[PDB]
């Protein structure tokens, strides 16, 4: 499955996050969405730590949501990189 880390737009608006989900649905690709903000103004720090581990990063500088990973686990990037991935 593709793995998409992002925000639920009902709690924190994330147009790129919603676009990533819809692009995977139109391409008939199963995905799992991981919401990093379970309620307004509260981050899930276990999921952010897991994301940093997967990215191999020590700082959060410049990280935006969504962050997408391919079925084999490699990092794709944000929605702009996912658009490119299917070409």
From Swiss-Prot:
Effect of residue 66 to A: 30% loss of ability to be reduced by thioredoxin reductase
InterPro entries per record: GLR_AS (IPR011767), Glutaredoxin (IPR002109), Thioredoxin-like_sf (IPR036249)
Span of domain Glutaredoxin: 1-87
Gene3D superfamilies named in the record: Glutaredoxin
Keyword DNA-binding: no
Function in brief: Serves as a reducing agent for the phage-induced ribonucleotide reductase, but not for the bacterial ones. This specificity may be the result of sequence differences around the redox-active disulfide bond. The oxidized form accepts electrons from bacterial glutathione and will, in turn, reduce other small disulfides. Can also be reduced by NADPH and by bacterial thioredoxin reductase.
Name recorded for this polypeptide: Glutaredoxin
Organism: Enterobacteria phage T4 (Bacteriophage T4)
